[PDB]
Design an enzyme around this catalytic site. Structure first.
Site, mmCIF file in Angstrom:
data_model
loop_
_atom_site.group_PDB
_atom_site.id
_atom_site.type_symbol
_atom_site.label_atom_id
_atom_site.label_comp_id
_atom_site.label_asym_id
_atom_site.label_seq_id
_atom_site.Cartn_x
_atom_site.Cartn_y
_atom_site.Cartn_z
ATOM 1 N N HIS A 137 21.570 57.740 27.925
ATOM 2 C CA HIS A 137 22.415 58.901 28.211
ATOM 3 C C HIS A 137 21.642 60.185 28.471
ATOM 4 C CE1 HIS A 137 21.822 59.621 23.863
ATOM 5 N NE2 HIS A 137 22.048 60.890 24.160
ATOM 6 N N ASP A 184 20.978 72.520 23.187
ATOM 7 C CA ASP A 184 21.232 71.345 24.011
ATOM 8 C C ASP A 184 22.602 71.624 24.637
ATOM 9 O OD1 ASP A 184 20.094 68.174 22.512
ATOM 10 O OD2 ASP A 184 19.003 69.721 23.582
ATOM 11 N N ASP A 234 25.175 69.467 24.677
ATOM 12 C CA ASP A 234 26.193 68.833 23.852
ATOM 13 C C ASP A 234 26.388 69.525 22.506
ATOM 14 O OD1 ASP A 234 23.669 68.117 22.974
ATOM 15 O OD2 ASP A 234 24.273 66.118 22.313
ATOM 16 N N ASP A 290 16.164 66.684 11.193
ATOM 17 C CA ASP A 290 16.947 65.554 11.670
ATOM 18 C C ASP A 290 16.978 64.525 10.543
ATOM 19 O OD1 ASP A 290 17.754 63.045 12.913
ATOM 20 O OD2 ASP A 290 17.409 64.084 14.824
ATOM 21 N N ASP A 301 11.123 63.931 24.380
ATOM 22 C CA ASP A 301 10.686 65.315 24.190
ATOM 23 C C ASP A 301 10.706 65.784 22.738
ATOM 24 O OD1 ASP A 301 13.660 65.200 25.079
ATOM 25 O OD2 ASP A 301 13.502 67.092 23.966
ATOM 26 N N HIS A 353 26.640 69.601 16.812
ATOM 27 C CA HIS A 353 25.759 68.980 17.800
ATOM 28 C C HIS A 353 26.074 67.486 17.878
ATOM 29 C CE1 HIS A 353 21.355 67.943 19.127
ATOM 30 N NE2 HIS A 353 22.255 67.682 20.058
ATOM 31 N N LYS A 403 29.748 61.521 23.106
ATOM 32 C CA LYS A 403 29.920 62.915 23.501
ATOM 33 C C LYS A 403 31.368 63.391 23.426
ATOM 34 C CE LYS A 403 25.511 63.184 24.444
ATOM 35 N NZ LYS A 403 24.607 63.626 23.338
HETATM 36 O O1 LIG Z 1 22.932 63.872 32.341
HETATM 37 C C1 LIG Z 1 22.254 64.595 31.637
HETATM 38 C C2 LIG Z 1 21.744 64.221 30.353
HETATM 39 C C3 LIG Z 1 21.010 65.096 29.679
HETATM 40 N N1 LIG Z 1 20.691 66.433 30.177
HETATM 41 C C4 LIG Z 1 19.814 67.184 29.157
HETATM 42 O O2 LIG Z 1 19.074 66.578 28.121
HETATM 43 C C5 LIG Z 1 19.465 67.164 26.799
HETATM 44 C C6 LIG Z 1 19.073 65.821 26.270
HETATM 45 O O3 LIG Z 1 20.089 64.949 25.621
HETATM 46 P P1 LIG Z 1 21.411 65.041 24.709
HETATM 47 O O4 LIG Z 1 21.856 66.409 24.369
HETATM 48 O O5 LIG Z 1 22.504 64.197 25.287
HETATM 49 O O6 LIG Z 1 20.387 64.362 23.688
HETATM 50 P P2 LIG Z 1 20.462 63.879 22.179
HETATM 51 O O7 LIG Z 1 21.084 65.040 21.506
HETATM 52 O O8 LIG Z 1 21.318 62.697 22.141
HETATM 53 O O9 LIG Z 1 19.023 63.619 21.598
HETATM 54 C C7 LIG Z 1 17.890 64.102 20.567
HETATM 55 O O10 LIG Z 1 16.794 63.518 21.289
HETATM 56 C C8 LIG Z 1 16.801 63.931 22.750
HETATM 57 C C9 LIG Z 1 15.560 63.205 23.265
HETATM 58 O O11 LIG Z 1 15.086 63.230 24.582
HETATM 59 C C10 LIG Z 1 16.599 65.484 23.026
HETATM 60 O O12 LIG Z 1 15.332 65.968 22.481
HETATM 61 C C11 LIG Z 1 17.775 66.207 22.291
HETATM 62 O O13 LIG Z 1 17.494 67.578 22.281
HETATM 63 C C12 LIG Z 1 17.839 65.660 20.773
HETATM 64 F F1 LIG Z 1 18.893 66.309 20.113
HETATM 65 C C13 LIG Z 1 20.861 67.712 27.070
HETATM 66 O O14 LIG Z 1 21.267 68.602 26.047
HETATM 67 C C14 LIG Z 1 20.682 68.235 28.487
HETATM 68 O O15 LIG Z 1 20.051 69.510 28.542
HETATM 69 C C15 LIG Z 1 21.153 66.887 31.421
HETATM 70 O O16 LIG Z 1 20.902 68.001 31.859
HETATM 71 N N2 LIG Z 1 21.928 65.918 32.099
HETATM 72 MN MN LIG Z 2 21.868 66.976 22.197
#
Ligand SMILES: O=c1ccn([C@@H]2O[C@H](COP(=O)(O)OP(=O)(O)O[C@H]3O[C@H](CO)[C@H](O)[C@H](O)[C@H]3F)[C@@H](O)[C@H]2O)c(=O)[nH]1
Ligand SMILES: [Mn+2]
Length: 278
Positions: free
Chosen positions: A78, A103, A105, A130, A188, A240, A246
């Site tokens: 995702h 982020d 989300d 985390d 990242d 978050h 999502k």
């Molecule tokens: O289609 C997309 C998917 C992701 N993003 C970007 O990537 C961030 C990355 O992912 P999620 O917010 O969906 O990530 P997740 O919260 O699930 O994951 C944890 O691990 C991730 C690892 O890559 C990131 O570091 C993220 O900040 C951290 F909270 C988003 O906020 C967004 O800025 C986009 O722009 N378009």
């Molecule tokens: Mn996120």
């Protein structure tokens, strides 16, 4: 305050909702948005701005080349490559000594001023822990971290940009990836933890409340600092939705997801092409 978001065209509609959640929680604070734009269409940029305060007078899109991070792992489905743009924040923003990265989300539910006012000293950034990763037995150590260095979530970061600008964060990131490419599981997020361990200011979990924080409503460490930071101080300031589930998805059982829909419904302008996404 200065808020930073990163998004590609796919997340343009969600960016707008998230940004509006920040404005709603700060009725009398100037909110300056800086968007690391990895390919957002002209139509989507206009639509995001049209829905913000003053018609978007406080939002600047900064072009980023997603190819820059072509060599970095992308195992989490995702998540798009745009997730790595934050690594060059020191190259993308010159006017701020400090920025609050969020982020896409996220749903801000309370003022961020306490976090924004946090004095980072010579630390690289301030972030919330985390709980999920911290309790993943042996993982933290695989990326060179000590038991006493707490793994932070990269979804909410108060960044000491002035310090970052004194270093080549992207180069340091590339070298770290070269070193841990075969073990890193969180892209990242791993990089940021590996590079800054020992130089992180921890924020209370109210500023990065994720599914695991909700579920915790045992305890990994006895350390009082760890306990103080991981015990969320109500009310939640930032929801978050870390992970595949999502708020803009179907059957989101994540707490507070309903606020997303309420905000999306309050949008001033909603392009036909956003109707499905929102
Ligand atoms: O289609 C997309 C998917 C992701 N993003 C970007 O990537 C961030 C990355 O992912 P999620 O917010 O969906 O990530 P997740 O919260 O699930 O994951 C944890 O691990 C991730 C690892 O890559 C990131 O570091 C993220 O900040 C951290 F909270 C988003 O906020 C967004 O800025 C986009 O722009 N378009
Ligand atoms: Mn996120």
């Amino acid at each position: 305050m200065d808020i930073v978001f990163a998004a590609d065209d796919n997340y343009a509609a969600y960016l707008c909702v998230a940004a509006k959640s920040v404005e709603a929680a700060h009725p009398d604070t100037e909110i300056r948005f800086h968007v690391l734009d990895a390919g957002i269409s002209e139509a989507n940029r206009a639509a995001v701005a049209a829905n913000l305060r003053g018609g978007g007078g406080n939002i600047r899109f900064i072009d980023v080349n997603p190819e820059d991070f072509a060599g970095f792992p992308l195992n989490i489905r995702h998540i798009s490559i745009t997730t790595y743009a934050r690594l060059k924040l020191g190259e993308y923003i010159a006017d701020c000594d400090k920025v609050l990265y969020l982020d896409i989300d996220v749903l801000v539910r309370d003022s961020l001023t306490p976090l924004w006012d946090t004095d980072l000293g010579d630390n690289w950034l301030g972030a919330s822990i985390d709980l999920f990763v911290e309790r993943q037995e042996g993982y933290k150590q695989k990326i060179g971290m000590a038991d006493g260095e707490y793994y932070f979530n990269a979804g909410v970061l108060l960044i000491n940009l002035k310090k970052w600008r004194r270093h080549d964060i992207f180069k340091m990131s590339s070298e770290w990836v070269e070193q841990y490419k075969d073990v890193m599981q969180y892209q990242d997020q791993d990089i940021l933890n590996g590079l800054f361990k020992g130089g992180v200011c921890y924020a209370n979990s109210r500023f990065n409340f994720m599914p695991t924080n909700y579920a915790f409503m045992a305890s990994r460490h006895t350390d009082p600092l760890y306990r103080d930071r991981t015990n969320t101080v109500m009310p939640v300031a930032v929801s978050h939705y870390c992970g595949p589930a999502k708020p803009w998805h179907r059957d989101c059982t994540a707490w507070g997801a309903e606020r997303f829909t309420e905000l999306a419904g309050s949008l001033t302008t909603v392009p036909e092409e956003w109707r499905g996404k929102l």
